[PDB]
Amino acid sequence: KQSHFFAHLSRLKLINRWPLMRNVRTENVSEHSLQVAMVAHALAAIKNRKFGGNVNAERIALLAMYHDASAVLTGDLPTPAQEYKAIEKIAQQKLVDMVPEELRDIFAPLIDEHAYSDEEKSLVKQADALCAYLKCLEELAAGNNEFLLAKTRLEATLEARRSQEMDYFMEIFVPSF
Amino acid sequence: SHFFAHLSRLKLINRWPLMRNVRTENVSEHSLQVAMVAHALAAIKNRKFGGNVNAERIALLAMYHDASAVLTGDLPTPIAQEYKAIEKIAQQKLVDMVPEELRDIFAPLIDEHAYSDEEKSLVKQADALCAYLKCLEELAAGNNEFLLAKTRLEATLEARRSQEMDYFMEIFVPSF
Numbered sequence A: 001k002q003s004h005f006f007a008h009l010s011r012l013k014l015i016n017r018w019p020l021m022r023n024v025r026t027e028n029v030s031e032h033s034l035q036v037a038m039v040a041h042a043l044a045a046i047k048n049r050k051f052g053g054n055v056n057a058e059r060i061a062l063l064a065m066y067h068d069a070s071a072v073l074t075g076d077l078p079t080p081a082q083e084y085k086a087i088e089k090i091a092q093q094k095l096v097d098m099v100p101e102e103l104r105d106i107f108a109p110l111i112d113e114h115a116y117s118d119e120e121k122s123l124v125k126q127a128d129a130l131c132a133y134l135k136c137l138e139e140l141a142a143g144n145n146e147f148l149l150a151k152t153r154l155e156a157t158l159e160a161r162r163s164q165e166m167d168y169f170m171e172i173f174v175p176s177f
Numbered sequence B: 001s002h003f004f005a006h007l008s009r010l011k012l013i014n015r016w017p018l019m020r021n022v023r024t025e026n027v028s029e030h031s032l033q034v035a036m037v038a039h040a041l042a043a044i045k046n047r048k049f050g051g052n053v054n055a056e057r058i059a060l061l062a063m064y065h066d067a068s069a070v071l072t073g074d075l076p077t078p079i080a081q082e083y084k085a086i087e088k089i090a091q092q093k094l095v096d097m098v099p100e101e102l103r104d105i106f107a108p109l110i111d112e113h114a115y116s117d118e119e120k121s122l123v124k125q126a127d128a129l130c131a132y133l134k135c136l137e138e139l140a141a142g143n144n145e146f147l148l149a150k151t152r153l154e155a156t157l158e159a160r161r162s163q164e165m166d167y168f169m170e171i172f173v174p175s176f
């Protein structure tokens, strides 16, 4: 009768990120996911507006809201391979199976990373790395040089995932960090 | 633009200040939760109750519904002009930070002036449910300071009641 779906989702704010490092301020997956949603939405809208995009930006926000949701079952694994992809995908399916059946098909394509189109997938992973970068920028602005190397390698991930909408974002929103 | 700079501060603004909290909730956590609950409410409406709402728009509006808090701090629900007044001021201050070329995209999200009636309703249902869920968490943890607020908000839920909420309450809430 009842679904534990939201009780489990409610746990996201307990799962802390960047564990291998001293954090001036602990970020949890809840804070992370909202920032990714906001950035991923901003990036989609920019693409649409200036760069010929035709992506559903509202949808992209909702995918970003959910992109790390399976952490409530697995915990957070620090980035630094095929097996983790495994558990995570098992974890995402288990979450999906908690949703009442009559709603399953609304939630499955938000939770299950297989469902992301090529362009949705790009935008969300660009937002994710941005947000990870912005974290490094915050920590460093606080004097915390443990995020130094993480900054550098994230600069590599960003250039790999480079786009016009990312360049706009960087030049326009990031320097204030 | 300092806009995204200032949005990243949502995580800094703490809710339920008048009270001891077993766990401190910030606006960033609340907003994600309201967005998730409000999307579900919308999708429940559409799927079970003949709704024709855009649940994704509703999620996006919910993400931004307390965004101006980063300029004002949180403002406890017990004058009501005084808070509604600072509110409009802060929203516009956040709006004027957005690059002009993108302002039309973010302004409606920040200033909330163009919510349909059903969207106002859904997001507010979701905001009160989340406040209620917080009470339930706190009370489970043995925090009796939220007992009063739990009873306040049951009335708030009753007044905003709907078939969607009734579904969510029956299906998702008791697990809390």
Ligand SMILES: Nc1ncnc2c1ncn2[C@H]1C[C@H](O)[C@@H](COP(=O)(O)O)O1
Binding pocket: A016, A017, A018, A019, A020, A068, A076, A077, A078, A079, A080, A128, A129, A132, A149, A150, A153, A154
């Ligand atoms: N370079 C580096 N070192 C240590 N931890 C890192 C690094 N980059 C990201 N992360 C962390 C942030 C989260 O704790 C987890 C997954 O990040 P997500 O980006 O959400 O998958 O890995």
Ligand SMILES: Nc1ncnc2c1ncn2[C@H]1C[C@H](O)[C@@H](COP(=O)(O)O)O1
Binding pocket: B014, B015, B016, B017, B018, B066, B074, B075, B076, B077, B078, B127, B128, B131, B148, B149, B152, B153
């Ligand atoms: N009954 C009661 N007592 C004390 N504080 C309360 C009460 N109800 C809500 N709140 C608080 C929770 C937030 O800190 C703020 C506005 O949140 P909003 O997003 O507008 O719910 O008001």
Ligand SMILES: [Co+2]
Binding pocket: A032, A036, A067, A068, A128
């Ligand atoms: Co992430």
Ligand SMILES: [Co+2]
Binding pocket: B030, B034, B065, B066, B127
């Ligand atoms: Co709210």
